[model samples]
Target chain A: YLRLFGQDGLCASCDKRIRAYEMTMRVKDKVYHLECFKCAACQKHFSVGDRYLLINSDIVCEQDIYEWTKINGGSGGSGGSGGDVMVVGEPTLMGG
Target chain B: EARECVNCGATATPLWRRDRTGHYLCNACGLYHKMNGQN
Candidate 1:
């Protein structure tokens, strides 16, 4: 299915191979580090001095954001059609 | 969010679980270099 899909470029932070990326109209085909999107922010062990990434002027990172697809709360990348994702309620797997 | 690779451009049938990497290979190409600083 969609999981078999590949990425077009690399991550903007860790410089890792990107298997998926979200190209917004604002960025105009800008590439991003895959792991950059994996967590809300770049991993502390990965990036050097960059603490925040500016996406359309919004400050975000692993500590403040999360990938909706990897969270296992949706259709696993089936266009998010499995069901409505439940946000802010009970605790779930992958305690962090 | 947009890109795709069915089987590393290999000529054989697909056989492997999905991962971010470890799938793109071209035996004929003979230059299996790592991408994006990853090994």
Candidate 2:
């Protein structure tokens, strides 16, 4: 009894309507555009194989994390989590 | 272009997906959206 599409919703990045049957990427309870996923500091693309950190709700890459830590004079405890995500299953149009 | 997910309030890249109703949703939410159906 899993539910994926109860009602269509909006994208967190761009305030636009999302239609069923489209491909998307989700992180935690938040969903993102495939390309939308990136380092908040550098705004670079995460290879989907890279380990990034979420600092203050902002996505930060390893390099950025290191740089930030250095500039801050220590690990400020970003309170971040690990790993990239890949939410499977696209909305299937069935005789609509 | 830099954008934010309207659902969870996250930063978005240029490759975000769009829905039929004109609302743009992130990938994670998209999965949830699909699963919410009878499928």
Candidate 3:
């Protein structure tokens, strides 16, 4: 059953093909190379037990969120929709 | 109908301006941003 597709995935950040055996991370629906799983603003790599947020499919750190709120002037205003900050953890693969 | 997407900087032929964030986004990004954020 598993022999048909052979486990080929695409890295969301670089848009390159990655095999199942390669070092990678899957966050929600997007899969990324290990190195590509970093903060979009500061380029800080995410490690296990790290706290992060998703802003429009872009992974960002807490500091980035602070800066973003400051710059955007908190336009969301705690009511309107879109650009909601979703807290998520780094995903790790097992038995790879 | 035509506006520059704040994120990608492309002229989105069908664009949406998020009132809360006040950022213009293309349909592709805007739809996902709105749907996935629902609590």
The fraction of reference interface contacts (C-alpha pairs within 8 A across chains A and B) present in each candidate is 0.00, 0.00, 0.00
Give the per-residue lDDT digits (tens) of candidate 1, residues A1-96.
Answer: 335433345545554664434321122244453233333343322121123233442224323333532443323444544433221111112212
Docking class of 3: incorrect
> Lowest summed-lDDT stretch of 10 residues in model 1 chain A?
A87-96
Candidates' DockQ values? Answer: 0.02, 0.03, 0.02
Give the TM-score ranking, best first.
3, 2, 1
iRMS for model 1?
A: 11.7
**Which 10 consecutive positions of candidate 2 chain A have the poorest summed lDDT?**
A86-95
Q: Pick the candidate with the highest DockQ.
A: 2
**lDDT score, candidate 2:** 0.50
Candidate 2 structure quality by residue, lDDT tens digits, A1-96 = 644563346656656565554354334555555555556768765433234565444565664656755564555356553333332334224223
DockQ score for model 1, please? 0.02
* Model 1: docking quality category: incorrect
Evaluated on CA atoms against the true complex, candidate 2 attains a DockQ of: 0.03
Interface RMSD (C-alpha) of each candidate?
Answer: 11.7, 8.0, 15.2
Q: Mark the regions of model 3 whose C-alpha exceeds 4 Å error after superposition.
A: A1-8, A21-25, A72-83, A94-96, B1-39
